[PDB]
Scaffold this motif. Structure first.
Motif, mmCIF file in Angstrom:
data_model
loop_
_atom_site.group_PDB
_atom_site.id
_atom_site.type_symbol
_atom_site.label_atom_id
_atom_site.label_comp_id
_atom_site.label_asym_id
_atom_site.label_seq_id
_atom_site.Cartn_x
_atom_site.Cartn_y
_atom_site.Cartn_z
ATOM 1 N N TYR A 208 6.230 -8.332 -2.369
ATOM 2 C CA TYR A 208 6.375 -8.702 -0.774
ATOM 3 C C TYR A 208 5.111 -8.824 -0.150
ATOM 4 N N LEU A 209 4.181 -7.632 -0.217
ATOM 5 C CA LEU A 209 3.015 -7.436 0.264
ATOM 6 C C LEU A 209 1.949 -8.344 -0.392
ATOM 7 N N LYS A 210 2.019 -8.510 -1.789
ATOM 8 C CA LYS A 210 1.339 -9.730 -2.469
ATOM 9 C C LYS A 210 1.458 -11.050 -2.101
ATOM 10 N N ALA A 211 2.774 -11.316 -1.684
ATOM 11 C CA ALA A 211 3.318 -12.763 -1.200
ATOM 12 C C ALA A 211 2.975 -12.946 0.298
ATOM 13 N N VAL B 190 -2.840 -3.635 -3.939
ATOM 14 C CA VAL B 190 -1.852 -2.881 -3.655
ATOM 15 C C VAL B 190 -1.355 -2.091 -5.143
ATOM 16 N N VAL B 191 -1.549 -0.796 -4.949
ATOM 17 C CA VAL B 191 -1.247 0.133 -6.002
ATOM 18 C C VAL B 191 0.382 0.438 -6.170
ATOM 19 N N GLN B 192 0.931 0.122 -7.161
ATOM 20 C CA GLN B 192 2.107 0.251 -7.495
ATOM 21 C C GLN B 192 2.494 1.145 -8.457
ATOM 22 N N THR B 193 3.351 2.350 -8.483
ATOM 23 C CA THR B 193 3.829 3.211 -9.382
ATOM 24 C C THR B 193 4.991 2.573 -10.249
ATOM 25 N N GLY C 145 -5.184 -11.920 2.944
ATOM 26 C CA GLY C 145 -6.363 -12.061 2.104
ATOM 27 C C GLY C 145 -6.055 -12.034 0.554
ATOM 28 N N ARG C 146 -7.073 -12.186 -0.458
ATOM 29 C CA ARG C 146 -6.856 -12.367 -1.618
ATOM 30 C C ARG C 146 -6.239 -10.953 -2.289
ATOM 31 N N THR C 147 -5.125 -10.870 -2.579
ATOM 32 C CA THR C 147 -4.402 -9.738 -2.901
ATOM 33 C C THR C 147 -3.776 -9.510 -4.487
ATOM 34 N N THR C 148 -3.949 -8.369 -5.128
ATOM 35 C CA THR C 148 -3.603 -8.228 -6.274
ATOM 36 C C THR C 148 -2.612 -7.059 -6.372
ATOM 37 N N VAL C 149 -1.761 -6.762 -7.245
ATOM 38 C CA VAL C 149 -1.088 -5.637 -7.374
ATOM 39 C C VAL C 149 -1.338 -4.893 -8.624
ATOM 40 N N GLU C 150 -1.685 -3.731 -8.562
ATOM 41 C CA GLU C 150 -2.194 -2.905 -9.905
ATOM 42 C C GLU C 150 -1.152 -1.941 -10.296
ATOM 43 N N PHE C 151 -0.614 -1.947 -11.339
ATOM 44 C CA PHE C 151 0.397 -1.133 -11.797
ATOM 45 C C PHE C 151 -0.042 0.236 -12.428
ATOM 46 N N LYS D 261 10.199 3.326 12.839
ATOM 47 C CA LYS D 261 10.341 2.209 13.964
ATOM 48 C C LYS D 261 9.069 1.053 13.548
ATOM 49 N N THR D 262 8.358 1.263 12.775
ATOM 50 C CA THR D 262 7.079 0.197 12.628
ATOM 51 C C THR D 262 7.419 -0.913 11.642
ATOM 52 N N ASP D 263 7.197 -2.226 12.105
ATOM 53 C CA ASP D 263 7.271 -3.294 11.341
ATOM 54 C C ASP D 263 6.183 -4.194 11.182
ATOM 55 N N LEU D 264 5.402 -4.103 10.178
ATOM 56 C CA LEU D 264 4.284 -5.029 9.958
ATOM 57 C C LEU D 264 4.487 -6.183 9.441
ATOM 58 N N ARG D 265 5.798 -6.739 9.084
ATOM 59 C CA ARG D 265 5.920 -7.959 8.273
ATOM 60 C C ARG D 265 5.275 -8.961 9.063
ATOM 61 N N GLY D 266 5.378 -9.197 10.181
ATOM 62 C CA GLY D 266 4.771 -10.276 10.930
ATOM 63 C C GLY D 266 3.426 -10.604 10.975
ATOM 64 N N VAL D 267 2.551 -9.440 11.106
ATOM 65 C CA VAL D 267 1.390 -9.282 11.192
ATOM 66 C C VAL D 267 0.587 -9.404 9.751
ATOM 67 N N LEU D 268 1.330 -9.344 8.532
ATOM 68 C CA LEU D 268 0.579 -9.460 7.320
ATOM 69 C C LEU D 268 -0.546 -10.452 6.846
#
Ligand SMILES: *C(O)(O)[C@H](C)[C@@H](O)C=O
Length: 268
Positions: free
Chosen positions: A228-231, A212-215, A235-241, A196-203
Motif C-alpha cells: 500500500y505504501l509503495k502504491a 520501505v523496509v519490510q520484515t 515519490g520514487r518508492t521501493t520495498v526492501e525485504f 487516531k492517526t490516518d496518513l492515507r490521504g497525504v501519502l
C-alpha cells in the motif's frame, strides 16, 4: 521553544561526518539507544543526527505536554526545530514505527529538507477500514488501552516479546528496558495518538524518494501495508525485504538492517 534548550531536552547527538546527513528517529517504547548496533555502520560515511522523542523514558517526563502532543504534528514541529537549530538544510531521514509517520509528515511540511526517507515498521493507519487492512479492530485496541492502564508492567512484559517477534532474548530484554522506562500515562497517550492517526490521504504529497523496509512478519504491520505504501507514496518508492521477522530489526537483526541502510543512504 528552542534551538539550544530543545537540543538538550531531546538529547540531540551528532556523530560521524560527511556531506550526507542522516537523521535516526526511534519508535514507541525505545530511545535513541535502539540505534547503537547499526550506528557504527553509518558514522564513517555520514554525519548522523540522533535524538529522543519527547515521550522517550530517557527524556524528563515533565516536558511531556499532553495537550500539545495529542497529534503527530507536534512531534514534527520538534524534529523540524532540531534540524533548523543545527542549520541542516538537507538530510535523509530513517524513522521507525511512529517516527516513520513523523517522517512522512515532516517530508510534506518541508520537502526542501528531506532528500530521502527510510521507513521501518511503517504504517499509515493501524485500524481496519472498509477496503483497508490495517491489522487492528477498535475493540481490540480498547482492551490494549485498558491493560496499559490497569497493569502497565504486566502489559509491557507481554508486549516486548511479541514486538521483537523473533526469539532473540537480548533484544527482548533491551526493548523491555526502555518500555519500562516510559511513564505509563505517556505510553498510553502516545498509543492513543498513533491509533487516531490516518496518513492515507497525504501519502501522495510526499515528494522524497522512499525505501520501505519490510520484515517477514510484523505484529503491528500486515504485509499488505508495505505494498500500500509503495502504491500510494508520492515519490520514487521501493520495498526492501529483510530475511527475518520482527517490528524492531535494529534491535534483533542490526547487521542485516545495516546492509539495507548503507545501500539506501548511498545517494540522495
Ligand atoms: C510504533 O511502535 O511507534 C508504532 C506506532 C506502533 O508500534 C504503535 O505505536
Amino acid at each position: 521553544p528552542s534551538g539550544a534548550k530543545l537540543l538538550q531536552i531531546l538529547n540531540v547527538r551528532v556523530v560521524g561526518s560527511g556531506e550526507r546527513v542522516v537523521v535516526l528517529s526511534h519508535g514507541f517504547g525505545t530511545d535513541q539507544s535502539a540505534w547503537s548496533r547499526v550506528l557504527p555502520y553509518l558514522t564513517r560515511d555520514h554525519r548522523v543526527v540522533l535524538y529522543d522523542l519527547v515521550c522517550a523514558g530517557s527524556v524528563n517526563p515533565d516536558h511531556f505536554d499532553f495537550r500539545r502532543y495529542d497529534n503527530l504534528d507536534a512531534y514534527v514541529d520538534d524534529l523540524l526545530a532540531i534540524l533548523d537549530a543545527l542549520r541542516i538544510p538537507r538530510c535523509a531521514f530513517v524513522g521507525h514505527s511512529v517516527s516513520a509517520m513523523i517522517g512522512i509528515l515532516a517530508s510534506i511540511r518541508r520537502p526542501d529538507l528531506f532528500a530521502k526517507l527510510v521507513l521501518i515498521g511503517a504504517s499509515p493507519r493501524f485500524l481496519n477500514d472498509s477496503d483497508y487492512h490495517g491489522g487492528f479492530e477498535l475493540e481490540e485496541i480498547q482492551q490494549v488501552f485498558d491493560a496499559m492502564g490497569a497493569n502497565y508492567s504486566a502489559w509491557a512484559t507481554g508486549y516486548a516479546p511479541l514486538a521483537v517477534g523473533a526469539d532473540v532474548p537480548a533484544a527482548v530484554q533491551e526493548f523491555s528496558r526502555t518500555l519500562f522506562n516510559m511513564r505509563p500515562d505517556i505510553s498510553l497517550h502516545v498509543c492513543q495518538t498513533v491509533f487516531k492517526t490516518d496518513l492515507r490521504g497525504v501519502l501522495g504529497m510526499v515528494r522524497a524518494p522512499c525505501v520501505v523496509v519490510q520484515t517477514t512478519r510484523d505484529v503491528s504491520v500486515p504485509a499488505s501495508v508495505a505494498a500500500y505504501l509503495k502504491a500510494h507514496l508520492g515519490g520514487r518508492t521501493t520495498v526492501e525485504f529483510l530475511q527475518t521477522e520482527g517490528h524492531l530489526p535494529h534491535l534483533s537483526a542490526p547487521s542485516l538492517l545495516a546492509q539495507v541502510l548503507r545501500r539506501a543512504l548511498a545517494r540522495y
